[PDB]
Amino acid sequence: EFLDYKIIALLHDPPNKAWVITGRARNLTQQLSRKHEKVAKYIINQLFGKNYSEKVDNADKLASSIDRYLGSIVYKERSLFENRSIFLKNILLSNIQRDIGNLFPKDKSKLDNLILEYKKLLNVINKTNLILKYQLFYLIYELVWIDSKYENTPSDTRNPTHTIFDHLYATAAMMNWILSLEKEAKGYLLGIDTIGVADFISKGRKTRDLWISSYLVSALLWYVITWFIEEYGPDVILFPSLRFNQFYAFYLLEKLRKEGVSEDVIDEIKELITKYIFNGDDLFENLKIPPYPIIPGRITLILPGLIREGEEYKKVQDDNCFISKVKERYNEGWRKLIEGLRCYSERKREDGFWNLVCRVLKLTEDLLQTTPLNIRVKQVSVTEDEIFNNNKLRSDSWKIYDNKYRQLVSEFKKSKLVKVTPESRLKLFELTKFDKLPQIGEKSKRGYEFCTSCGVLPAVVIMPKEDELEKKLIDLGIARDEKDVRSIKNMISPGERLCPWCLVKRALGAEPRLMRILLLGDLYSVEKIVNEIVSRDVKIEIPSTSDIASIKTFEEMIEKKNEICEDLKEEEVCEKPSESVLSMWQWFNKNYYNGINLTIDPEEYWFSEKRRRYYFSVFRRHRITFPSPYYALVRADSDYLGDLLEGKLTPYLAGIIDSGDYANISEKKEEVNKLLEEYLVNAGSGSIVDYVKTVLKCIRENLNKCSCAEKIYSNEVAKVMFRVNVEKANVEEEVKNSLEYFETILNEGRIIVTPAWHVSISSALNRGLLVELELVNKHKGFVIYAGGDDLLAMLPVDEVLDFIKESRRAFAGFGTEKLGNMCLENGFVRINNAYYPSLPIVGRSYSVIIAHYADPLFFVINDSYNLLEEGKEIIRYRVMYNGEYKDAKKDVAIFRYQGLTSVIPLSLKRPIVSSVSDFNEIASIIDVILELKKRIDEGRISVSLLYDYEKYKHLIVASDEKYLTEFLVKDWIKRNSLRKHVEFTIDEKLYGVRLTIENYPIKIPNDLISNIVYTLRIIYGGE
């Protein structure tokens, strides 16, 4: 029968739930006639009503920790543990509140005017599609909320840990269970993990290969969840969230274009998408795809144990249904993409390259059957035996998630003990032993060739070396004429051997609009899309490493538009933009109509061996700094975000509390006790904090149970007698359960994770991602994969340090720029009065590879990943928390320049921030290196500075007084001089910091100032 009654779960709480409760205006009372239920009933003016007997009695009392962190009745009272104030605290920090103010919807009409846009954006959806109305409303609930300048709301004022919507969007997650448990008692946790994503991104020769490999990861994982968001509604996903997802917004308005809909109401949501889910750009319509891969290649689902094919729902019929479903859907998406590619290429039997692609696809189908990217799927079951005392909830049922989630992650960890590579799946023994491989192209004189892009797979398309191509490309089978070589030679450089998979990658890179075969899925035919693409032809320019290395050269030619052009005037560098080619590279996109043709290959003009002397002369005659061949590969991964989703404290104390320290956490009782108690007592807002801290004192030093339940109770009973209409109290059960909660928290040693925790972390991850998207674009960078926690960009070697600093600060919500529509504010993310949380507790590491543009991207990406993996686990730098010099592991920045390495600690504080004060301390060492590089460039210091610190280093690391070392560095600089009457000293927190390493080939100076000067050596070495 028809189901998914979670539209009732999404409007579960009133829009003024913290203004209705703790009334300031109260005018809404006398002009709309329980306190917060007439409000939730007047916001239901579209669809199915409410059932306070089915949803709120159990589910909302399970989605958030607030119920367990308060107690069933005080979390339900609305009236006892009160505070006339209102705040909104971070989830990871309970110190930084937010002034909320109130110019919210205050009237029966100025709120029905929110109902106006809830109407309009839900009036093209008939009841034909029971889902699509919900599938639409779910996303833009927030969009229409914030489009009106209404400040967002805490979860509820007794515990402002959570916000209004994550407490509302984590309702439906548990609602899946509420609906699949009332019937046949099956709940599931589906987890999709992609195997060898790093090695996959590592395979490629050009940046377009990397970019569409990351896009293949994201699209092949978006395909499988297309069905999950189309069947069980949207709220089936926890990681990654979709509250601010570009992929989901794109797919949503495409599904809106389905069924037949005017292009006149789709714009009313497209504006909310371009404005908030994006940051102003509408290039995702002129590109017809989402511009960046954002799907994290590892995803968690909250499923109800149901299915379709009974014309309606039905209890799932197997223990292994979802696994088979998702594996088959994954293979299905892959083969649909490859067949749509075959058809799009057959649509172009001309152009040479497309013709060669056709010619070799038909030879490699039975090899191209296999997907190039295996996935791991693990599930976990839960039934009513585990949740209910046959009529109600249970005690230790609230912890059932924190147990099943941990079981799931445990099996993920165990299965990750064996890595199988996607190449091991193929059958090649006979194809290599017995010459069977299709060798269209040249022919190897050693059996077969290896793919130059892949490295392991044999090569199908072999390209002759650049000595005479046409006289070979034509007598061989590559090309047909002279015109088609220029288009084959346009994508496959001479000498590029290609395996079927990497050749398919090249094919997709030719026009990356075939991705809509996967990006949408389930929605249009595999041929609708090929027709759409062959109709509106659009070419995209993906930048090579040569384009990134030559960024400032291009930039300095466009500020001499004709003053440099008249010199050449002939070689199409300064000639017309012929077509309307656009691209995802924001700097390329914002600088195209500026005189100079940005689509030239620097490997042709100033990186060539027949030219570049002419171009050296041309640049000499114009004050053009001749380009460096180096670019910055900047990678970054979050610190302990796995443990953080597991509610562990290694995110909070990185290096102090090892992950191995959790096996028997009985040892490090002290730091966990300290910080957890701090967080808990600060998580409250109101007189409730007294109750919780005195409970904690009753938990202090194994004090007592059944005894100290009076001092805490002589205030709880005081509070229930402090009102006029209380009904019943079982304080015996309730205060005991309240102490049992914190006792479990401390005994285990981790904040018990509820769905609201996950959706809050995931939403903040996506929002920080939206911030970093425009931070990369602020520094002429090219994103290969920026998804949430991690990042993989390519920037000039010039603004890598600036970007590192500002990115590591914005990850913690500390910045001064507006980054589109998003104006981050000291730990939060302000979006036009909406204060969304951030991750100011999570550290973040950073890898930087200064690479020559001709360096093989395989080893470059592999070195980047291996640094960011080995080093963060393997390095220890001095830190003090609680006033004691301890060690620390994560949250650093490693640099590498063909042999030089350096590490720059990013926090030097283990609760990396705990006050609003320490927000500026983040990346403080980096601005010092930036200032010092600001002095070296302008000719106030000599680079001899970077070769002269060794002599002072002996003295200074054996040195033991502060101001002694102060003067010592001051005079070391003052032999290369910095200034007249010196003004730039090192800030005296940098000394005594000693970096250790667990005996690895990564050699490093044991001190932070020598590492600062090696970072300067590495940055310069690439300029």
């Binding site: 042999g899 030089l900 070296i936 000599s942 680079v943 070769y947 610190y949 050699k1003 070495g1021």
Partner: protein, 283 residues
């Protein structure tokens, strides 16, 4: 057969040398030398073979086919070279000596560690009783020396004490009574404890700053300053050339290797940083 005969030879630096490695270390030098696994200065076999092959192609242009056969071919490189060089390993480095004793005046001395001699013996043991050319006396000398590992040993001397490289006092002791010199340059050799020997050695290397001057206003250009590292003149390396049995390998060993004293190794040759004298251990 299959490396029948071998030729070990000494690489005596006539000028300073700089076989470069990019910026391949974590020191303050920006153009370091090629480093061993022990951080000592080494010459890779690629560099040694490439330089020697280039030199021989220039100065024996008629023997180009013999040289191609022994050392490889530019194109049609589907014919394995029947000759090979081992990595050149530092055998001895000159050091400035302020000697206190012996009544004999010395101002520089050859210095080694026991790690260096260990690798030299590794090269040497793997040839003699395996191949057929017999120079066991050198191996016996190196074994006699390696016996005393763990104490600064002087060789062929009466020193008993010295300041090395103006910075290190060391107390020496003769080996037994007397021994044939392993080098023929009449200068004492000292084998030092592997810990003070490497400080002395890394103070014997030449680490210079260098400057690019603005050609008109005679000042340094901004950022036109870097560091380089030369192995000092008179330094000695040690390598072996291994020959697979063939006819033109005999031509190599007869016509060519018997007229090779001086070649050019490494780079920065306009500075004059590559001249080398090859002494074969056959005299």
């Amino acid at each position: 057969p299959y490396y029948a005969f071998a030729e070990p030879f000494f690489i005596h630096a006539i000028t300073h040398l700089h076989v470069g490695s990019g910026s391949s270390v974590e020191e303050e030098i920006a153009l370091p030398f090629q480093r061993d696994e022990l951080g000592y200065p080494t010459i890779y076999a690629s560099s040694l073979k490439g330089a020697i092959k280039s030199f021989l192609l220039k100065e024996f242009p008629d023997k180009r086919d013999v040289i191609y056969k022994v050392l490889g071919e530019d194109e049609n490189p589907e014919e394995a070279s029947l000759g090979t060089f081992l990595d050149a390993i530092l055998f001895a480095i000159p050091s400035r000596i302020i000697e206190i004793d012996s009544a004999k005046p010395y101002v520089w001395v050859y210095v080694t560690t026991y790690e260096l001699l260990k690798k030299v013996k590794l090269y040497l043991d793997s040839i003699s009783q395996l191949s057929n050319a017999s120079f066991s006396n050198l191996k016996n000398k190196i074994d006699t020396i390696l016996a005393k590992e763990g104490k600064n040993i002087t060789l062929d001397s009466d020193l008993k004490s010295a300041i090395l490289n103006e910075d290190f006092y060391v107390e020496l002791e003769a080996l037994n009574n007397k021994i044939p010199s392993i080098i023929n340059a009449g200068v004492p050799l000292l084998v030092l404890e592997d810990s003070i020997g490497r400080e002395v050695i890394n103070r014997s290397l030449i680490r210079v700053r260098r400057i690019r001057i603005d050609r008109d206003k005679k000042v340094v250009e901004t950022g036109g300053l870097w560091s380089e590292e030369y192995v000092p003149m008179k330094t000695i390396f040690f390598s072996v050339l291994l020959g697979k049995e063939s006819k033109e390998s005999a031509i190599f060993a007869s016509c060519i290797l018997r007229n090779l004293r001086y070649v050019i190794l490494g780079g920065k040759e306009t500075i004059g940083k590559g001249i080398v004298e090859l002494r074969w251990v056959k005299d």
